[PDB]
């Protein structure tokens, strides 16, 4: 059952702009930052970009590697990922933090799914957004080190 | 390959 | 890069997956 | 046998479930029948809208065997509807004033009244709110519950015997009965 | 300016520093706004954070002698909408009005007390679910909350609505 | 449709919402439906004193010497529901041979009321009636095949 | 009030004057 979440989409939908807005991170590159103070439980805004299949996102990650051209991809289902790397919404500026602010959901809607970043608490303007990207567990030569900066940090983003 | 994701 | 307000379903193209 | 929605009398566009209890629409109102259907007696069926983004909309209602499947309930002499879009009541595609319209959540009530001898009636319920008689003295035949749908709208059928908002105004039986 | 009553509440309810949200606490129980309201059509909202399975609310409006250890609706003196199924509540009574309500829903709360036609109208997410009483006691009534077992909302008094009317004028309850 | 119990505690806070007083077609004041009632409702109570058959007899005898109109209802056998003085807006429901409503008496710890229900579904702004029972003045119910005589 | 009321009859409340 949908309970209120159409609502709260479609609403989300004409509003996330006053939201947000991006600037340098403290973390890494560009983030979003909340333009206003956002409440727990609220949807913030919308992943956006091309929806691929899964060895498509292989051959694709290869060349946006080939390019230094960072991780863009959120995967949607078993079979589905959403690419967007080069066309897309500012959500794909969105960091990782040990410490998140926000989470990632998929709301199963009858037209299709949608990935939907939500508060997890109240959020105070100024403050940059970030969730937890749950990247896959690898090795030593794959892993990657985190820098969110906060109090606790696990160091890593595996 | 690498992606962020929900869980 | 362009912004997208909806998802929009990738058109593959015949060579896609070629080297 | 236990009352579902029709495995063949029913559009071929129109999206059902495997339990043969939720459907969803395709493109321009279609309709899907019940396997059962009542033509002596008072009935009672519900129906929840799932889901029901905007420019989709619904039809729901009564209808006889000859109901056209290919066009909304109420097209036609043979079926009687609800529509979600301002509560209009429609038969042979004439619109009337009836009640405010439904949406997404709703729980809707149908309830039929075909009484023998010593007046017919269809009533529509809102939640559980009783929204007048809609049709009185209506064609002598079987009616069937029935759905029609426009667009890619989800609603889920409860033939009973349990409801969400029982009447308790009327008496009634469940067309789980059938 | 318009809050929570840190007094006209049962104690046992849980109030934010800036009281504005609130939390349950067991058996239905009930807290009213600060400012009341005899005459004019007035507005509030209020934002269901969490619910959690088997907890409930019961909102609408109280006058000053509405039963704070009681739900909403209880006796003469309040008319509340409930979250489980959208019944209506007035003197004990339940009537079905309007489909249920829950976690994340956005509720809005209109009144209109004519100088002398009242009536009590409850909104789900912007869509105005009907007249809900007609005709009510007069008397000066207060935003109010009821909640049983711990859920949570969050309570708007104005000037600004996520879902503000767009079928009849109001003025926010925040003008008091 | 539930307990007669609850139908009644539902009844007492709402019975105003379901009637008005009128001139009546039939004589004097009327009571009306202020709006659609089904069938099996529960209306309105006929309120009053509750008084034991003689003291009836002698109330009534002194009403009339002072010229004060009489509103009475027998309950059962041995008890009167006097609404001359103590009545509500139920003193008012004209008779009819073909009513619309019914008087019964609901049996109640409590104590026993005098409940008006509808006989079928009636509409706004109709005129409430019942079969008052009869054991001579000429009725004026205006009904097809009145039977022509009341007391 | 709206409700019924039990009269309480006196000793004397059939006697004549
Ligand atoms: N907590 C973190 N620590 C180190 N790098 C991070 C990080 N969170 C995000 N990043 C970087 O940002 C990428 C995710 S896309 C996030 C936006 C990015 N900061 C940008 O300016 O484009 C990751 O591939 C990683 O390189
Ligand atoms: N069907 C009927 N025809 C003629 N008189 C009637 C009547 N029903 C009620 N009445 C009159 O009303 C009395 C009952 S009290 C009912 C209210 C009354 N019409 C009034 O205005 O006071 C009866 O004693 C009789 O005098
Ligand atoms: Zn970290
Ligand atoms: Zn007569």
Not at chain 1, 10 to 35: D, F, H, P
Request: one cysteine or more; proline letters at 4%.
């Amino acid at each position: 059952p949908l309970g209120s979440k159409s609502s709260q989409y479609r609403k989300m939908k004409t509003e996330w702009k006053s939201n947000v807005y991006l600037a340098r991170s403290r973390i890494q590159g560009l983030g979003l930052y909340a333009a206003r103070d956002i409440e727990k439980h609220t949807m913030v805004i919308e992943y956006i970009g091309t929806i691929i299949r899964n060895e498509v996102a292989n051959r694709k990650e290869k060349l946006y590697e080939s390019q230094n051209r960072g991780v863009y991809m959120f995967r949607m289902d078993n079979d589905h990922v959403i690419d967007a790397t080069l066309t897309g919404g500012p959500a794909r500026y969105i960091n990782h933090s040990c410490a998140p602010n926000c989470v990632a959901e998929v709301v199963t809607f009858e037209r299709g799914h949608k990935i939907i970043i939500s508060s997890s608490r109240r959020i105070q303007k100024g403050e940059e957004l970030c969730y937890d990207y749950k990247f896959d567990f690898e090795d030593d030569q794959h892993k990657i080190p985190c820098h969110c900066g906060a109090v606790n940090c696990r160091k890593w983003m595996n | 390959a690498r992606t962020k994701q929900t869980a | 890069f362009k912004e997208l307000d909806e998802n929009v379903e990738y058109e593959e193209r015949e060579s896609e997956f070629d080297i | 046998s236990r009352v579902l929605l029709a495995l063949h009398d029913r559009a071929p566009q129109l999206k059902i479930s495997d339990d043969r209890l939720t459907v969803v629409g395709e493109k321009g109102y279609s309709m899907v029948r019940a396997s059962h259907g009542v033509r002596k007696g008072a009935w009672y069926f519900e129906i929840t809208v799932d889901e029901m983004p905007p420019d989709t909309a619904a039809r729901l209602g009564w209808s006889q065997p000859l109901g056209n499947l290919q066009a909304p309930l109420g097209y036609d002499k043979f079926s009687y509807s609800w529509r979600s879009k301002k509560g209009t009541k429609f038969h042979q595609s004439i619109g009337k004033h009836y009640s405010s319209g439904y949406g997404q959540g709703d729980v809707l009530g149908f309830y039929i009244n075909l009484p023998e001898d010593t007046s017919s009636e269809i009533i529509f319920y809102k939640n559980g709110v009783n929204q007048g008689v809609a049709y009185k003295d209506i064609f002598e035949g079987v009616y069937f519950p029935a759905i029609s749908l426009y667009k890619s709208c989800t609603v889920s059928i409860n033939f009973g015997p349990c409801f969400k908002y029982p009447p308790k105004d009327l008496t009634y039986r469940p067309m789980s009965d059938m």
